[PDB]
Amino acid sequence: ECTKFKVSSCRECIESGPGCTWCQKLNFTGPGDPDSIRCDTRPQLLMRGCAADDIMDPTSLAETQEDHNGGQKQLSPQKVTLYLRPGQAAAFNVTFRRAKGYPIDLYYLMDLSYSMLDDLRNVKKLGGDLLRALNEITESGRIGFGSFVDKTVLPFVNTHPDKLRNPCPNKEKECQPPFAFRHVLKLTNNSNQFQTEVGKQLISGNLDAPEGGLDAMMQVAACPEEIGWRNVTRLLVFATDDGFHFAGDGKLGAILTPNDGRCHLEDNLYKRSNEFDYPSVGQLAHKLAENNIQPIFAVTSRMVKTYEKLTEIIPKSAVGELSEDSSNVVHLIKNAYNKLSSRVFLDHNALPDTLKVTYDSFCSNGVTHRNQPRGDCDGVQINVPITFQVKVTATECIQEQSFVIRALGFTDIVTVQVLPQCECRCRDQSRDRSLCHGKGFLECGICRCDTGYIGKNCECQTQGRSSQELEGSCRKDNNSIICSGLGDCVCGQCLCHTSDVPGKLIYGQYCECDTINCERYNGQVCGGPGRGLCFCGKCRCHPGFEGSACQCERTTEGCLNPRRVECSGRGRCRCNVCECHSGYQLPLCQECPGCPSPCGKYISCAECLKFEKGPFGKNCSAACPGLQLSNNPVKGRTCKERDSEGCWVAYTLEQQDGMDRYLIYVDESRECV
Amino acid sequence: FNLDTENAMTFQENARGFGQSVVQLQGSRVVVGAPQEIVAANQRGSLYQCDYSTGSCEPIRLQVPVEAVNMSLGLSLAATTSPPQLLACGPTVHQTCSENTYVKGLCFLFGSNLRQQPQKHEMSQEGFSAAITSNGPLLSTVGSYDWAGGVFLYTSKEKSTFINMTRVDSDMNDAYLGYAAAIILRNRVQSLVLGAPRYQHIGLVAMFRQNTGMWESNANVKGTQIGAYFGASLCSVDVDSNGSTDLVLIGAPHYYEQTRGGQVSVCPLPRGRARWQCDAVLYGEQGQPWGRFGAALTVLGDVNGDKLTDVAIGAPGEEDNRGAVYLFHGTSGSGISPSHSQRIAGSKLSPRLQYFGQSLSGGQDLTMDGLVDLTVGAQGHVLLLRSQPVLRVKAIMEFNPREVARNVFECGKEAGEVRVCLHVQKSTRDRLREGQIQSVVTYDLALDSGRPHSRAVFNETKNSTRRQTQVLGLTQTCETLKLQLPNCIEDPVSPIVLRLNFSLVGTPLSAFGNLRPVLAEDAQRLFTALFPFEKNCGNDNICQDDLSITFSFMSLDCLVVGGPREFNVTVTVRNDGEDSYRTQVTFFFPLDLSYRKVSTWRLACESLKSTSCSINHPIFPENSEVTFNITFDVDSKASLGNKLLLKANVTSENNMPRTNKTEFQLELPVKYAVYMVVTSHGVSTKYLNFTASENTSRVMQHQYQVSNLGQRSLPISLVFLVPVRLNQTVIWDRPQVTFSENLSSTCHTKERLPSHSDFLAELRKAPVVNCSIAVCQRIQCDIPFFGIQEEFNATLKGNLSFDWYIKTSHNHLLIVSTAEILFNDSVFTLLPGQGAFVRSQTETKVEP
Ligand SMILES: *[C@@H]1O[C@H](CO)[C@@H](O[C@@H]2O[C@H](CO)[C@@H](O)[C@H](O)[C@H]2NC(C)=O)[C@H](O)[C@H]1NC(C)=O
Ligand SMILES: *[C@@H]1O[C@H](CO)[C@@H](O)[C@H](O)[C@H]1NC(C)=O
Ligand SMILES: *[C@@H]1O[C@H](CO)[C@@H](O)[C@H](O)[C@H]1NC(C)=O
Ligand SMILES: *[C@@H]1O[C@H](CO)[C@@H](O)[C@H](O)[C@H]1NC(C)=O
Ligand SMILES: *[C@@H]1O[C@H](CO)[C@@H](O)[C@H](O)[C@H]1NC(C)=O
Ligand SMILES: *[C@@H]1O[C@H](CO)[C@@H](O)[C@H](O)[C@H]1NC(C)=O
Ligand SMILES: *[C@@H]1O[C@H](CO)[C@@H](O)[C@H](O)[C@H]1NC(C)=O
Ligand SMILES: *[C@@H]1O[C@H](CO)[C@@H](O)[C@H](O)[C@H]1NC(C)=O
Ligand SMILES: *[C@@H]1O[C@H](CO)[C@@H](O)[C@H](O)[C@H]1NC(C)=O
Ligand SMILES: *[C@@H]1O[C@H](CO)[C@@H](O)[C@H](O)[C@H]1NC(C)=O
Ligand SMILES: [Ca+2]
Ligand SMILES: [Ca+2]
Ligand SMILES: [Ca+2]
Ligand SMILES: [Ca+2]
């Protein structure tokens, strides 16, 4: 509903709420009614006498610009404009469509530690297969190569002059001295160059169990011209079999200077590696994002679970189980590419907190998400349109500004222009000035007055004293103090005072409402600005909150177990907190401590189901209501008792959703006395 | 705010690495390491002892050994003030052996003079972090056992003990345990906390305790984000200064968010056998990605003067690696405040500062003013952020006369008088003399602040506002200024109101180096005083009333803290004699309660703490009576004592004397909610055969597992009833209670006779064999402290005696023993419904 803080001009009604509306007809206000009545919820305006052509919300709206000649537009509209309103979100439908024929640039960055010897043996004869598999998706592909080991300093590698020459543990074998990063091959469409340049690489080794490849990826991002990236799809395969060093590890080597992310390549070697630490994971993640490079973490089975956590930090990255000899590189790359292209993340660039950009996603295969922080969809087919309902809420009447929406991993962007629709376009200015006593001017049906006059019709001059007959009308009843003692009558309306105490606004028609008198939660009125606002004894909540002081949420409920039932079916939950019956405990009621084992009294049930005995006088199905037998073992309480035949029935009783219902699994190897 | 930067003292040195590590030393000396300054062949790292008086630094004449060290000396430092000790370690001693160059640590312990010192599992880097215990230095090896970690605790230069975790499937490899270390005091007994910033890839921090001589790891916590590097720095904080540690701070400088970098978390000490868990997280400013917030941690003691320990946290990555430092206050609830109190930025100090805040040290006074000083490290610079004394201002406005005379206001030469008193006080204790602290204060007085056309003006300005400035000492100072009313007032409904708001500027202390006082950030900067008009409710007489208050916890027997969470009291207020103006009722109640709502008059209320409720402002009619339900919220973890003393008294603008009925107090019993569950267990011998040919001795056991699922540690008295004899024949021989958890308790036995003599017919009626068919013994075990969330297996064991077996109609008999948990009902109670499980029984069935 339209809650109004003493509004007195058309645009103030829009600032004062998302559902509020203004009406322009002159008949809408009588002598005893304040101009604030112009602002209320739309049906009440219709009931009072407003009309569909006399009303002006104004609704937040969008304009979409598109190119007719542009075929297979991967991200449309090209640019949009929003006449945003505070609180009332605008919506517009950005459409995504997967295109064909977009080439691929593949850079292969590999660990050269001693455990990667066989992987390096297999990779050096893989360039042609990788390039052809790139061509099997889209034509005109390119490949590259890159290598890392670790920083050339203790503890990470021993600095003895003999061991620096030959760091690999097998002394007999011939191996290259340690290095941080070496750029090996330029991005080319020739397989011969790949099989030539890579073949000159030799194995190496460090001392520590992690490796430095985070700073190699940081250099592969920092050196665009040397690597050879086009403005096309860029892939970065990262092949490791163990963990990585990251920022902070350099203190053991007396290194404390941060990695700066600039291109420090000299003669294809990352010289000056020891004067910089390792980068943080956030450095790599952020820098790859601002260059449209998509990491493919080819990691071994033991490291998969560790590397999955990077994807929460790095969108447009994929992790795949790499074999112990990197035999499945091509299949892993293809699967990662399919996952990357089907998983279309659609996210904006950073924007002021005054904008609450929100996405509704109508994905393709029947799934739909609501109020997600970023657009989410999966299984995006080729040439199958997808729709994202971008919901943009302002709360400010923002100054005209702009942000960019982008489909992550793609250069295509949507420019969004945003403008304050808070101004009013009332046509009443054409009316004669006689209505404003010849002093003010009439717009939206209210006689707006200059600095020299005040009042509903500019009847009261700012220099003249207030008439007693006008002051006497600012009372609810004979017992009410003038303006409730918290204001003054100015031309028949209470000009409210302000309170030196923090946050105490005084408002309402007779200056009788204070925003601090509602009942408190955690010592704050309505829980503070973060939960709701006070209207002289009544609390209005933001969406997602309810109750007398907005202390009770209506969303992201903690009542719900992962099976989507309230308190596991054995308790109501008032105000997001489950309330239980009997000896059940918070929060999800999953287990009951203290209640004795009921196994001894369900023997009457287990005696029938698993053994298929006939009725016990009373029918078996009615003898054991609310229970099911499982064909597979189940987890929970274990029990053993004696049956009617004197045999040991060893069974388990897993509790499930609802009240007094379980699953029973009984051992078939019956033993009897 | 408190830490000074306008006149910050600075040390410069062209030494490579100068400012990497700083520790304060007793007096006015600071030891600064330069872990990269080369001074000789194969020698890098030297100590620089810096003095406030000399304004410079000279190297400590240390006799470094000749074993091709490259110690990187000064990378780690430690010190204590009583006795005077200081520890310097070189983590990286490059021992170039025949095949490999190992890295070990070498350690220097100094006394009062920095002249000569002792110097006394490869790859260990023994002195990566250092601490001085009450028996010697504590050295941390980040690289022991394949970079798993560990520490060496030294009692003497010849004897030491290694401390680390138990090894489980190489999960602790590369963890770097000992990358940070700290000492926690438990009843003045030394205990250890260690950090592993690389654990797996998420991080880990653990506590080590001296449980019966040996060092064991009892609790540990883990980090969330990969690469956040959780555990880089540790800081044990004793917030309350009682002599026991309260919190451990765990820094994760590389936590990554879209607009933030780095976080620190608060982990209060676990109580009893409870699991250790975090409860808060701290963050730097937004828009400062890669700020490395939480790289440096230190204890500054009490900075603002409130007896609660405060922490400073380094953020050297902010503003393009020019860095910042964050000050966090400790809170009275044994916590740390979620938001920083001060940020010091290297930009505002000097353009030359890089990596500002990479090192911190605090705990001692170096300026000899009596205030703790913080020393901060930077690349080639060291600064002394001296803590400035905190000044609070108490303003007393006393209108004379106390109320506006009737003839002065009733319908422009009319006048009044107000006395304003500004009193400046120190929140901290220090060595500054009287008269040294000078402050310049400017304040504004506003008559009818918040209203247009104010009803009163000042005499010396002839308008409703006055600004005044003066230089004030640390003592009571007063000045009196007259007031005027420019008009008559025909609506005397609300007083004249005076507002005072001020800003304080502290003059620099010339003797101590231009140190300035600072006004407290939480000090009340706005003061309001009411100048009420005279009333006329009578034959021109002065107003008076007989206001009284009574209230009762009606239909309420005892207050249960654990539930329900809300209780409300029927407060009634009665007035007699004459009308009362602006009646306010103040409720004084323990800190653990809070105020929610007031219901049924224009009745509105605002919040030993206090709560003032406005009973129908401005007036409360003749002979009126009002009843309302002041609703309070009781904390779940509250501790109100044995009884809670609510105290409320009423006041009015008439300022009548404190009659005996104007104050009411009524203590109600406090009865802490506990929830204890006792149950049998499956291992109990629930069934046996029948044996009647000859008597036998067979052992059987009933385990009445006891748990505490509430949030109160309580003393319990636990009782078993065990059959011992039936028909003059023993069923049990010697029932021996046993506890497997070794908790301290004592047990005894008592025997009592059966309640019924009809054992020949009760068996015919039912096959139950308990203390109503047989003689039973009573084993009572007293436990003085049963803690929170702890369980023990109270078990009974003894040999059954088949000397009484009765061949009744039922082919089975039941030996029943019942265990019920008695507790002092005067203080403790069970919750309704769920409290039926305080007792349990176990039956041993005997049949074919
Ligand atoms: C903690 O320290 C103990 C020794 O104080 C370590 O125990 C040794 O572990 C190695 C691992 O291969 C064995 O070879 C030794 O035989 C063990 N020694 C003893 C006396 O048991 C233990 O590994 C360390 N654990 C961690 C996590 O660092
Ligand atoms: C976007 O499309 C969906 C159907 O996919 C439709 O329900 C919705 O109304 C559209 N958005 C707008 C703003 O019309
Ligand atoms: C010691 O440090 C010097 C200075 O950098 C260096 O030249 C020398 O090789 C180092 N010696 C060892 C054994 O690390
Ligand atoms: C008192 O407050 C007013 C308004 O906030 C401000 O303009 C004035 O400067 C303050 N007085 C002082 C002495 O700072
Ligand atoms: C007072 O407490 C009772 C019992 O909790 C509750 O039902 C009632 O709503 C509360 N408030 C009033 C005004 O009675
Ligand atoms: C106050 O609460 C009690 C119970 O807590 C209730 O019986 C009584 O009616 C309440 N008083 C009012 C005025 O609602
Ligand atoms: C009311 O109680 C408070 C509690 O400290 C006391 O200070 C005060 O003197 C009492 N009387 C009045 C009239 O406030
Ligand atoms: C003993 O057993 C009888 C029969 O089950 C029961 O009624 C009684 O409560 C039990 N306890 C005592 C103390 O008699
Ligand atoms: C009690 O004994 C059982 C079986 O020996 C065991 O599973 C249980 O953990 C024990 N209780 C406690 C608190 O350890
Ligand atoms: C009980 O039986 C055990 C084993 O059968 C035996 O060792 C013990 O001496 C017997 N008596 C007592 C009092 O425990
Ligand atoms: Ca391999
Ligand atoms: Ca303490
Ligand atoms: Ca403090
Ligand atoms: Ca000082």
Residue numbers in the entry:
A (entry chain B): 2 to 674
B (entry chain A): 1 to 120, 332 to 622, 629 to 817, 827 to 833, 843 to 1083
From the paper:
The Bordetella adenylate cyclase toxin (ACT) uses the αMβ2 integrin as a receptor, but the structural basis for integrin binding and neutralization by antibodies is poorly understood. Adenylate cyclase toxin (ACT) from Bordetella pertussis, the causative agent of whooping cough, is a member of the pore-forming RTX toxin family. ACT uses the αMβ2 integrin as a receptor, with binding required for efficient intoxication of macrophage J774A.1 cells as well as Chinese hamster ovary (CHO) cells recombinantly expressing integrin. For many integrins, the inactive conformation is the “bent” state, where the integrin headpiece points toward the membrane at an approximately 20° angle relative to the membrane-anchored “tailpiece”.
Subsequent 3D classification and heterogeneous refinement allowed us to separate the particles for the ternary complex from those of the unbound αMβ2, yielding final particle sets of 347,508 particles for the ternary complex and 1,114,670 particles for unbound αMβ2. Previous studies have shown that integrins are flexible in the bent conformation, with multiple copies of αXβ2 in the asymmetric unit of a crystal structure exhibiting varying inter-domain angles. Consistent with these observations, the integrin tailpiece in the cryo-EM reconstruction of unbound αMβ2 was poorly resolved. Comparison of unbound αMβ2 with RTX751-bound αMβ2 showed that the binding of the RTX domain stabilizes a conformation of αMβ2 that is partially extended relative to the unbound αMβ2. The bound and unbound αMβ2 are related by a hinge motion of the headpiece relative to the tailpiece. The position of the RTX751 L1 helix between the αMβ2 headpiece and tailpiece would result in a steric clash with αM in the unbound conformation, meaning the L1 helix may also contribute to the stabilization of the partially extended state. Although the unbound αMβ2 adopts a fully bent conformation similar to that observed in bent αXβ2 crystal structures, the ability of RTX751 to bind αMβ2 suggests that it transiently adopts greater headpiece-tailpiece hinge angles in solution, consistent with previous observations. Cryo-EM maps of unbound αMβ2 have been deposited in the EMDB and assigned codes EMD-26739 (composite map), EMD-27125 (global refinement map), and EMD-27126 (tailpiece local refinement map).
